[PDB]
Design a protein around this motif. Structure first.
Motif, PDB file in Angstrom:
ATOM      1  N   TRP A  28      59.814 -32.973  51.966  1.00 32.96           N
ATOM      2  CA  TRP A  28      59.456 -31.842  51.276  1.00 32.96           C
ATOM      3  C   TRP A  28      57.840 -31.790  51.340  1.00 32.96           C
ATOM      4  O   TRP A  28      57.136 -30.888  51.144  1.00 32.96           O
ATOM      5  CB  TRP A  28      60.050 -31.853  49.751  1.00 32.96           C
ATOM      6  N   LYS A  29      57.244 -33.203  50.968  1.00 31.78           N
ATOM      7  CA  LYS A  29      55.831 -33.403  50.985  1.00 31.78           C
ATOM      8  C   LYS A  29      54.996 -32.726  52.066  1.00 31.78           C
ATOM      9  O   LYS A  29      54.059 -32.215  52.113  1.00 31.78           O
ATOM     10  CB  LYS A  29      55.445 -34.704  50.515  1.00 31.78           C
ATOM     11  N   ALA A  30      55.755 -32.868  53.358  1.00 33.91           N
ATOM     12  CA  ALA A  30      55.079 -32.576  54.557  1.00 33.91           C
ATOM     13  C   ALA A  30      55.141 -30.916  54.689  1.00 33.91           C
ATOM     14  O   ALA A  30      54.056 -30.319  54.894  1.00 33.91           O
ATOM     15  CB  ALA A  30      55.791 -33.236  55.968  1.00 33.91           C
ATOM     16  N   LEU A  31      56.329 -30.551  54.542  1.00 34.94           N
ATOM     17  CA  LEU A  31      56.722 -29.012  54.299  1.00 34.94           C
ATOM     18  C   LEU A  31      55.444 -28.335  53.351  1.00 34.94           C
ATOM     19  O   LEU A  31      54.524 -27.462  53.967  1.00 34.94           O
ATOM     20  CB  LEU A  31      57.834 -28.651  53.844  1.00 34.94           C
ATOM     21  N   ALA A  32      55.240 -29.011  52.228  1.00 33.44           N
ATOM     22  CA  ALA A  32      54.165 -28.330  51.012  1.00 33.44           C
ATOM     23  C   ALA A  32      52.809 -28.464  51.871  1.00 33.44           C
ATOM     24  O   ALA A  32      52.339 -27.510  51.833  1.00 33.44           O
ATOM     25  CB  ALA A  32      54.368 -29.203  49.878  1.00 33.44           C
ATOM     26  N   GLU A  33      52.396 -29.420  52.375  1.00 33.89           N
ATOM     27  CA  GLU A  33      50.981 -29.634  52.819  1.00 33.89           C
ATOM     28  C   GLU A  33      50.831 -28.661  54.248  1.00 33.89           C
ATOM     29  O   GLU A  33      49.901 -28.428  54.144  1.00 33.89           O
ATOM     30  CB  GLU A  33      50.643 -31.205  53.269  1.00 33.89           C
ATOM     31  N   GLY A  49      50.311 -30.625  45.870  1.00 31.07           N
ATOM     32  CA  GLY A  49      50.788 -31.348  44.477  1.00 31.07           C
ATOM     33  C   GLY A  49      52.062 -32.116  44.549  1.00 31.07           C
ATOM     34  O   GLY A  49      52.564 -32.380  43.288  1.00 31.07           O
ATOM     35  N   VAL A  50      52.787 -32.233  45.617  1.00 30.45           N
ATOM     36  CA  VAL A  50      54.050 -32.800  45.776  1.00 30.45           C
ATOM     37  C   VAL A  50      53.894 -34.245  45.855  1.00 30.45           C
ATOM     38  O   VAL A  50      53.712 -34.640  47.061  1.00 30.45           O
ATOM     39  CB  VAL A  50      55.149 -32.034  46.948  1.00 30.45           C
ATOM     40  N   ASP A  51      53.698 -34.912  44.659  1.00 28.68           N
ATOM     41  CA  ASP A  51      53.453 -36.301  44.773  1.00 28.68           C
ATOM     42  C   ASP A  51      54.670 -36.905  44.240  1.00 28.68           C
ATOM     43  O   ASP A  51      55.572 -36.097  43.794  1.00 28.68           O
ATOM     44  CB  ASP A  51      52.252 -37.015  44.003  1.00 28.68           C
TER      45      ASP A  51
END
Ligand SMILES: O=P(O)(O)OC[C@H]1O[C@@H](O)[C@H](O)[C@@H](O)[C@@H]1O
Ligand code: ALF
Ligand SMILES: [Mg+2]
Ligand SMILES: [Mg+2]
Ligand code: NA
Length: 218
Positions: free
Chosen positions: A24-29, A35-37
């Motif tokens: 999910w963090k990779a997708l968000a970026e 902000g996906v920490d």
């Protein structure tokens, strides 16, 4: 005594909550949302694939087309599915295999109450399918976590009332779902994340049959 145990999968049976977070963090970026920490990810644990994407988009007040929404969820899932291909029985968290064996020996039903459509595949990878009396199909419930429906469905699939069941969860949304089902929650993780009002264990080695019976009794 309790008659069923209702298992979340990711972060309970194995360390795949970590992989959902990374994907999910990779997708968000990729879409310019940073902000996906780990702290924010506590709001994503337990939440369906589409609701997770929506929470990420909301974090940034971002609107995408319906076509782009579907593509993004597919992209994340395709990546996650690649990440989990090498999961094996060696990845089962400490205590979990022995718990499943002990539950079966004591005629306590075992059900999967996972939101993940990748659940059956992961149980196969880990040689765990034969321990489960039922797998609740997350595509069949009308409402996903923190709604209680998936836990209610899991209990009903093994012929046991939620009030005669224990639920095991690593997430805020899932703990709420267990509470509202009528089952007794036992969380795994940090009380700073999961609350100070239920029993929380620091790691899955604490999930012994010896430890679950006492919680039910107290
Ligand atoms: O995208 P999947 O595999 O259907 O998983 C859905 C959800 O399954 C839950 O178990 C996870 O805690 C969530 O992080 C995840 O979004
Ligand atoms: F981590 Al899950 F359903 F497996 F919330
Ligand atoms: Mg989980
Ligand atoms: Mg079977
Ligand atoms: Na297998």
């Amino acid at each position: 005594m309790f008659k069923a145990v209702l298992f979340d999968l990711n972060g309970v049976i194995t360390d795949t909550a970590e992989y959902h977070f990374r994907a999910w963090k990779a997708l968000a970026e990729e879409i310019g949302i940073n902000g996906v920490d780990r702290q924010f990810n506590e709001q994503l644990k337990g939440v369906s694939r589409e609701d997770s994407l929506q929470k990420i988009l909301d974090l940034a007040d971002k609107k995408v087309s319906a076509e782009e929404f579907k593509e993004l969820a597919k992209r994340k899932n395709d990546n996650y599915v690649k990440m989990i291909q090498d999961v094996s029985p060696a990845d089962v968290y400490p205590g979990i295999l022995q718990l499943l064996k002990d539950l079966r020996s004591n005629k306590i039903k075992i059900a999967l109450a996972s939101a993940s459509k990748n659940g059956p595949f992961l149980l196969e990878r880990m040689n765990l399918t034969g321990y489960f009396d039922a797998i609740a199909d997350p595509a069949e419930v009308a409402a996903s976590k923190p709604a209680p429906d998936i836990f209610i469905a899991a209990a009903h699939a093994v012929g046991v009332a939620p009030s005669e069941s224990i639920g095991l969860e690593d997430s805020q949304a899932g703990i709420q779902a267990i509470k509202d089902s009528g089952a007794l929650p036992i969380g795994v993780g940090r009380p700073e994340d999961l609350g100070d009002d239920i029993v929380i264990v620091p790691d899955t080695s604490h999930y012994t049959l010896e430890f679950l019976k006492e919680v039910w009794l107290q």
